[PDB]
Scaffold this active site. Structure first.
Site, short mmCIF file in Angstrom:
data_model
loop_
_atom_site.label_atom_id
_atom_site.label_comp_id
_atom_site.label_asym_id
_atom_site.label_seq_id
_atom_site.Cartn_x
_atom_site.Cartn_y
_atom_site.Cartn_z
N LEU A 1 0.84 0.94 3.04
CA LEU A 1 0.45 1.67 1.85
C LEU A 1 -0.93 1.23 1.40
CD1 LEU A 1 2.36 3.76 0.33
CD2 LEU A 1 3.41 2.28 2.03
N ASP A 2 -1.74 2.19 0.98
CA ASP A 2 -3.04 1.89 0.42
C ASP A 2 -2.88 1.47 -1.04
OD1 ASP A 2 -4.29 2.56 2.82
OD2 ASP A 2 -4.50 4.67 2.22
N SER A 3 -3.98 0.98 -1.62
CA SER A 3 -3.97 0.66 -3.04
C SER A 3 -3.69 1.91 -3.87
CB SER A 3 -5.29 0.03 -3.45
OG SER A 3 -6.39 0.79 -2.98
#
Ligand SMILES: CCCCCCCCCCCCCCCCCC(=O)OC[C@H](COP(=O)(O)OCCN)OC(=O)CCCCCCCCCCCCCCCCC
Lengths: 288, 446, 134, 151, 84, 112, 146, 55, 66, 85
Positions: free
Chosen positions: J39-41
């Site tokens: 997951l990205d930020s």
């Protein structure tokens, strides 16, 4: 009889006009009803300034009847929501809350002006007397424009609450089995259907006579029709529409903040007297 | 009238017998009841006894003191709880009360002055003896030296009046009207100090903040009235001179009332705020008094009675909170509705009375001073509107801020309100309302 | 526990601005179908800047934040049951020590409850001494 | 009782009146005693003009007499106000024609009241009121009635 | 228990014609909506109805019965010789 | 209608609540008179408000006679209310004709 | 506990060695500390804190020692905290527009509509009718028809 | 219900002061008898006067 | 805090009293409104004709002939 | 009514499963978002927004950094609602 009648009519007209527009931008259920109350107060103050007592008194009692009912409906609705007054969370209550929504519909229509409800007997005669007397051109427009606005926000509230698709949270306490709350409401509900006609035969020992052309007697109904459609239809939306409130951002913020009155009276004023308290005590009670 | 005096004198030995603290108030409350029966007074003096009489004006002020001085004993139960020289403390009040009774019951102007100031020294002992904070010194002197500095010149003005009138008796003085400018300043600048006026009030916030609870009662209860009572007797023969310089006093007090109300809003101390509230209302009392009209005179007499009971009442509540929270600052005292909810009711009623709320006797007097001032000049409507508006601005801030919010965090456990405290509050407020029924008596002293 | 440290990374400033931007978006477009449509586009605008230098990004946040504030709603949504909400912390609960001052007859209406509290008081002191060194 | 409710209205008025009249006639009135009370009469006393400038009892006599007469004169105005008060309530909606004479009586009384006790304030006494009259009369013969200005 | 948490497998995005209108738009724009399957539960027709059903019911609830009572009211009035 | 015409050409529009400005018998071979029905005593005895003491008083008095006869069920007197309103409608017409008359006459003088 | 005489501010700080002790005396690291200008109405060496958007703009979710004041344990208190308190002149977010802007719009609208209303006070829309013919004695009211 | 004890027995001493205080001023009124029934506003009619003076 | 709670679902069914009440309230309103329209249709439109002042003849107003 | 802990475990996972940029298999109580699930930020922000609407409150931006696995989110909601069962 004096110049005050000139002033009260102007100030009252703005009050009923301003909240009429303000009610079409506010999003708190509790507040929309409040501006609704205030908007119709300006209606009394204006006709009262014409010089009529029974008309003002008659509408005042009418306002108390259904307006109390509306707040009762709101309390049941809010308490079943998670204590949130915002209308953007609510929706689709016409089936999840049969009894309460029915209790609201009668009250809202009374405000709308559906013929022969509580509100109609007062609103009608008032508007008719306005068109019979010697009025100001600006005052006349506000009188009838507000009625359109009066119906506008009221069905705008219908869409965001009943006809609109549900928009609540995942866990919803939607329920309409609060009989103890409901029994008290039906006391008002009965009166809102007969309060109008009952008082007409009592308040007026000398009924007012009216004879106006069709193209103004029907103006009250026609604007209510336009207002109801305009308020409902514009409330709708799609994927590729224009957020007209956003686009005219400056105007919406002006009308959505009640013409900045809360700011003027709470943040544009209190700074000055309170500083003066320091300068005095700073320079006299412990200075000069 | 001697019935009262000799009753008090023979109650002096009760200070010496031990375990007689509570038997004293009953003798002090019972005498109020006895005094409460002998109301048959008129505008002119009545019940003469060697130099002691009483008219309707003196009666209400005397009866106010007996009531207030009796409540002092209830309020200051802590002195009894810690046996903190209680015997001496009792003797201070019994002496102090006698000086007040003589001061109001004196028929001659010289006597009024003789017991006028003499009551001060029993008050001065009270502050130093039983005050907590170190500043009772630096507030002990202010009370003594503002008063003495302006009362000593008054003594000259009194004697100069013998050589013209030939006597001190008040009735004989009213037959004269004097024209000398300085004499006017030697019989009113001495009372304008004790009212107090806005610019010479610097002693009042210090004396009240530092004095004990009982000292706060009498300082706010009867000392501010001796200035007011004195004026009511000596503007009778300064009518001509009063017209040349009244506009100076009216403006100062009226503008002084407004400015102090803003100062009230920027306070953060309960004792300070209540004390500054005294200057605000006392500005209206003085303003209406100097208008000299029938309304301004009757109204001023009324408000002095009502305000004393209230401001004395509000000093009870500050003491109650201070006794437990230990600090008198507003920041410490918050949300007391959630610690002592029964107490908060009394906070409201006494607070509401201070802002001229009905049906209190306070609103009756305030309606009248307002009438006289308006009749005096329609320009007085400007601040008189501001002053009445702001006179509620700080009262709500006093009540709401101290009772409503979320509770303080650091406060340690403390007792709840006791029956003594509730009974004390009732006796303050309950007469303040029922008196409206018989304002007939405590209003028409002229 | 952990007390947050005031220093906030640039990565976090973008994160917060993204959260505020979306929440502001809901207020304007209440309806979920519309909201999800516009929210997706909003996320696109961030991905078209994800590949940029920080110093360039410093310029992005500045105009990114100002336009948000320049487009703040006149009645932003909150959650009624949380900080800033209309219905936040309506009730206030006194500290525990209130109960101990009840009249002894009053305590007799809940003898079990006060029986337990005094067992807890014994435990609390030993707990408190260890935690703070007595 | 031509109206239905008015027929019901009188029924209640019988219920609330019936007992109290009986109670008044049965207990209170029959058991009471006969006793008469009188009305104070004050012999007129010399006015302040006869008083010397050095005696205080004679001044005190007149000051109290002046004050008693003030009360009688304060409220003879009050009675006249209540008449115009009552006519406006007993003659409406056509009350202007009938209260107009009563108000004329009222306004005249106020002026005579204000010519006599007016503008003295508190501490008004026999000496002050009489001395206002002396100054007023002197101005009248010299400058004519007030309101016309001086010459 | 107060409620039961249904399974994510139950919610299928193709059920709601309104949400599907969003996807064809995003495909044209070239994006994809991850948080779309959530919104499905709000638009279940059998338990929430549509815009049309909610509007008809809200305004005209009891109108059918309300008219029927009125016919009885006119019946009595005619039987009392009032309408004419 | 409107009242901008009065603003733009005031010579023709008599104006608000205009009192007649021409001779009442002008342009009439004759015009019959108007007769009261209710005496002063009758008006006062029923406390008829002054603004309602116009020519319709007797019908208004009849309304109170009946209305007081069935109070509170005044709907049993709805018939009587019709006549009083039926009459006061006539007065409004008379005021209308009185207005048009002056408007028509005021036009004539401008022409000549 | 001490008394006021043991806590009143010291005279305005003049030296760095004096500043550091002053900053120590108020539990402040030496960079926050900033005495008032000492024009002559100064508060002595008391710090200058707050004066911003106000107390209510402080982070609500932080675990304050005193949540009610939104203040920490020994932290000093701004000399004008009674004015920038949560209920006094403070706001959660910066105002949208300049303070002058709000007053102009409301008053500008109000004046703009005062003149319009009063300009139309003469041009009252009136129905086409003559005055009530209230029966007056000795006056002649007719009916139109012969 | 009073809740008074033997300590209130000392109360008689202050009540003693009351009677002594009452006695003196009552004795003072008996020294005030030279306008008694002689003032213009209450003075008795000249001739055939009541034996006992009022007050 | 209503005892009823529903997760991602419509609320439970409705008791007989609530189901009936909704119709009775709504139905009662309409019955009133219809009846007034039936018996008093002359209130929405003017109960008295507004006369066409223009239609009046110069003679009936006694307008003198130029 | 009381919010049982087991339901919190169900409610959290239901939302995550509906999230289309996650694996229904890897998804478990212990998994990490940015580490395990990729997951990205910004993606992690959107998840919290769902959590907020899921239970009805604000998760402060400062405190969202402690929420790096659904167990932590489960613990967080439990702490806020003080349901320790
Ligand atoms: C008229 C002319 C005569 C006036 C009266 C003159 C006599 C006044 C003094 C009479 C009291 C003398 C005894 C006394 O002081 O009261 C006792 C006590 C004093 O304190 P303490 O040292 O504890 O006394 C132990 C002796 N019983 O009591 C006290 O605590 C206070 C005593 C009063 C002090 C006044 C000074």
């Amino acid at each position: 009889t004096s110049w005050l009648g000139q002033l009260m009519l102007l100030l009252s007209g703005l009050t009923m006009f301003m909240a009429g527009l303000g009610a079409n931008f506010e999003f708190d259920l509790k507040k929309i009803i409040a501006l609704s109350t205030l908007s119709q107060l300006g209606l009394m103050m204006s006709i009262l300034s014409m010089g009529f007592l029974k008309l003002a008194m008659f509408h005042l009692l009418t306002h108390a009847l259904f307006k109390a009912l509306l707040f009762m409906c709101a309390g049941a609705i809010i308490h079943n929501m998670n204590n949130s007054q915002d209308i953007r969370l609510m929706g689709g209550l016409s089936i999840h809350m049969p009894l309460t929504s029915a209790c609201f519909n009668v009250s809202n229509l009374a405000l709308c002006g559906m013929p022969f409800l509580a509100g109609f007997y007062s609103k009608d005669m008032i508007l008719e007397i306005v068109s019979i007397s010697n009025v100001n051109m600006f005052s006349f427009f506000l009188y009838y424009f507000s009625t359109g606005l009066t119906v506008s926000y009221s069905f705008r509230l219908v869409y965001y609450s009943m006809t609109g698709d549900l928009n609540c949270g995942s866990l919803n306490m939607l329920n309409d089995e609060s009989w103890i709350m409901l029994r008290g409401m039906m006391g008002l509900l009965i009166m809102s259907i007969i309060g109008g006609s009952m008082l007409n035969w009592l308040i007026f020992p000398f009924p007012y006579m009216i004879c106006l052309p069709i193209y103004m007697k029907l103006l009250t109904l026609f604007v209510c029709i336009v207002g109801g459609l305009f308020g409902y239809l514009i409330s709708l939306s799609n994927l590729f529409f224009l957020n007209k409130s956003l686009f005219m951002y400056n105007l919406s913020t002006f009308l959505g903040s009640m013409w900045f009155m809360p700011y003027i009276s709470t943040y544009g004023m209190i700074f000055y007297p309170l500083n003066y308290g320091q300068l005095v005590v700073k320079s006299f009670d412990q200075g000069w | 009238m001697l019935k009262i005096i000799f009753f008090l004198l023979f109650l002096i030995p009760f200070c010496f017998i031990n375990n007689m603290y509570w038997m004293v108030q009953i003798m002090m409350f019972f005498i109020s009841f006895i005094f409460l029966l002998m109301n048959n007074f008129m505008n002119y003096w009545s019940e003469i006894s060697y130099f002691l009489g009483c008219d309707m004006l003196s009666y209400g002020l005397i009866l106010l003191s007996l009531w207030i001085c009796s409540l002092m004993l209830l309020a200051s139960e802590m002195i009894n709880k810690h046996n903190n020289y209680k015997n001496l403390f009792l003797l201070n009040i019994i002496i102090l009360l006698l000086l007040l009774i003589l001061t109001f019951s004196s028929m001659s102007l010289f006597m009024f002055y003789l017991f006028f100031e003499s009551s001060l020294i029993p008050t001065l002992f009270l502050i130093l003896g039983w005050g907590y904070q170190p500043e009772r010194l630096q507030a002990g002197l202010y009370l003594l030296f503002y008063t003495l500095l302006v009362s000593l010149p008054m003594l000259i003005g009194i004697f100069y009046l013998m050589n013209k009138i030939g006597s001190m008796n008040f009735y004989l003085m009213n037959n004269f009207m004097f024209n000398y400018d300085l004499l006017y300043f030697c019989l009113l600048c001495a009372f304008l100090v004790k009212m107090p006026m806005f610019l010479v009030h610097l002693w009042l916030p210090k004396a009240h903040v530092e004095a004990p609870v009982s000292g706060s009662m009498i300082l706010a209860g009867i000392m501010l009235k001796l200035g007011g009572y004195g004026m009511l007797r000596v503007i009778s023969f300064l009518q001509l001179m009063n017209l040349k310089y009244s506009f100076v006093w009216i403006s100062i007090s009226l503008v002084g009332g407004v400015l102090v109300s803003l100062v009230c809003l920027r306070q953060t101390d309960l004792k300070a705020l209540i004390a500054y509230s005294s200057v605000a209302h006392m500005g209206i009392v003085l303003s209406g008094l100097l208008t000299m009209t029938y309304w301004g005179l009757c109204g001023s007499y009324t408000l002095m009675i009502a305000h004393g009971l209230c401001s004395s009442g509000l000093f009870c509540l500050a003491n109650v909170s201070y006794e437990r929270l230990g600090s008198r600052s507003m920041l410490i005292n918050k949300g007391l509705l959630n610690f002592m909810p029964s107490m908060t009711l009394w906070w409201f009623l006494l607070s509401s009375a201070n802002m001229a709320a009905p049906p209190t006797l306070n609103l009756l007097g305030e309606i009248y001073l307002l009438n006289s001032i308006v009749s005096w000049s329609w320009i007085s409507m400007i601040l008189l509107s501001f002053l009445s508006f702001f006179s509620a601005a700080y009262t709500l801030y006093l009540y709401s801020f101290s009772q409503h919010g979320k509770l303080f965090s650091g406060v340690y456990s403390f007792s709840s309100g006791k029956i003594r405290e509730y009974l004390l509050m009732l006796l303050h407020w309950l007469p303040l309302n029922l008196l409206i029924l018989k304002s007939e008596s405590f209003m028409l002293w002229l | 526990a952990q007390v947050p440290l005031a220093i906030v990374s640039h990565k976090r400033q973008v994160c917060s601005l993204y959260k505020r931007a979306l929440r502001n978006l809901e207020s304007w477009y209440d309806r979920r179908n519309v909201y999800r449509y516009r929210a997706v586009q909003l996320r696109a605008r961030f991905d078209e800047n994800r590949s940029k230098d920080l110093g360039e990004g410093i310029r992005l946040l500045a105009c990114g934040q100002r336009e948000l504030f320049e487009t703040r709603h006149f009645q932003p949504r909150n959650f009624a049951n949380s900080a800033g909400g209309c219905a936040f912390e309506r009730e206030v609960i006194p500290p525990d020590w209130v109960l101990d001052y009840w009249h002894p007859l009053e305590k007799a209406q809940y003898p079990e409850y006060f029986a337990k509290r005094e067992q807890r008081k014994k435990e609390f002191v030993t707990w408190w001494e260890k935690q703070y060194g007595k | 009782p031509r109206s239905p409710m008015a027929s019901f209205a009188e029924s209640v008025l019988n219920v609330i009146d019936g007992p109290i009249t009986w109670f008044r006639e049965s207990i209170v009135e029959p058991n009471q005693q006969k006793q008469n009370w009188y009305h104070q009469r004050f012999r007129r006393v010399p006015t302040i003009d006869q008083c010397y400038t050095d005696d205080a009892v004679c001044r005190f006599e007149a000051d109290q007499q002046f004050r008693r007469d003030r009360m009688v004169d304060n409220e003879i105005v009050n009675i006249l106000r209540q008449r115009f008060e009552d006519c406006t309530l007993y003659e409406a909606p056509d009350h202007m024609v009938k209260c107009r004479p009563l108000m004329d009586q009222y306004e005249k009384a106020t002026e005579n009241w204000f010519i006599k006790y007016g503008d003295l304030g508190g501490y008004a006494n026999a000496k002050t009121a009489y001395m206002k009259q002396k100054h007023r009369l002197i101005w009248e013969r010299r400058h004519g009635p007030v309101g016309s200005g001086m010459k | 228990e107060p409620y039961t948490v249904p399974h994510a497998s139950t919610y299928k995005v193709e059920s709601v014609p309104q949400l599907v209108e969003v996807k064809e738009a995003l495909g044209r724009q070239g994006l994809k909506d991850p948080w779309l399957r959530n919104e499905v539960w709000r638009y279940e027709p059998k338990a929430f109805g549509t815009h049309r059903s909610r509007l008809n019911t809200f305004l005209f609830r009891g109108l059918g019965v309300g008219f029927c009572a009125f016919l009885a009211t006119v019946a009595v009035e005619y039987a009392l010789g009032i309408g004419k | 209608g409107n009242a901008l015409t009065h603003y733009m050409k005031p010579d023709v529009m008599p104006g608000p609540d205009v009192v007649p400005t021409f001779d009442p018998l002008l342009g009439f071979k004759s015009r019959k008179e108007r007769v009261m029905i209710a005496t002063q005593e009758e008006m006062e005895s029923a406390k008829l408000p002054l603004e309602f003491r116009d020519y319709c008083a007797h019908l208004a008095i009849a309304y109170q006679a009946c209305r007081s006869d069935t109070f509170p069920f005044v709907y049993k007197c709805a018939h009587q209310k019709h006549e009083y309103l039926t009459c006061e409608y006539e007065d409004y017409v008379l005021r209308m004709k009185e207005f048009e008359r002056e408007r028509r006459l005021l036009e004539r003088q401008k022409r000549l | 506990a001490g008394w006021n005489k043991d806590y009143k501010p010291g005279p305005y700080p003049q030296t760095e060695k004096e500043r550091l002790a002053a900053a120590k005396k108020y539990y402040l690291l030496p960079e926050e500390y900033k005495p008032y200008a000492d024009d002559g109405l100064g508060y002595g060496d008391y710090p200058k804190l707050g004066y911003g958007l106000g107390v209510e703009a402080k982070d609500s979710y932080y675990p304050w020692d005193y949540p009610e004041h939104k203040r920490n344990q020994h932290e000093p208190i701004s000399a004008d905290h009674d004015l920038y308190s949560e209920d006094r002149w403070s706001q959660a977010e910066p105002p949208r527009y300049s303070n002058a802007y709000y007053f102009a719009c409301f008053l500008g609208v109000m004046s703009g509509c005062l003149a319009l209303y009063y300009w139309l006070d003469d041009k009252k829309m009136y129905r086409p009718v003559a005055a009530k013919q209230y029966p007056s004695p000795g006056v002649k009211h007719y009916t139109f028809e012969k | 219900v009073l809740g008074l004890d033997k300590r209130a027995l000392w109360g008689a001493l202050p009540l003693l002061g009351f009677a002594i205080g009452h006695f003196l001023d009552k004795k003072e009124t008996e020294r005030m008898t030279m306008f008694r029934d002689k003032s213009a506003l209450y003075g008795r009619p000249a001739g055939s006067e009541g034996k006992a003076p009022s007050w | 805090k209503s005892h009823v709670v529903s997760y991602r679902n419509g609320p439970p069914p409705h008791s007989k009293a609530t189901k009936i009440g909704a119709l009775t309230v709504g139905g009662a309103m309409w019955w009133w409104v219809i009846w007034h329209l039936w018996h008093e249709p002359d209130h929405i439109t003017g109960e008295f004709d507004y006369p066409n002042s223009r239609k009046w003849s110069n003679t009936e107003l006694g307008v003198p002939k130029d | 009514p009381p919010l049982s802990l087991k339901l919190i475990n169900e409610r959290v996972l239901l939302v995550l499963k509906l999230y289309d940029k996650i694996d229904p298999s890897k998804l478990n109580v212990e998994s990490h978002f940015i580490n395990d699930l990729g997951l990205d930020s910004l993606d992690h922000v959107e998840v919290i927004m769902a959590m907020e609407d899921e239970f009805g409150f604000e998760i402060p931006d400062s405190d969202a950094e402690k929420l790096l696995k659904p167990a932590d989110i489960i613990k967080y909601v439990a702490d806020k609602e003080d349901v320790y069962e």
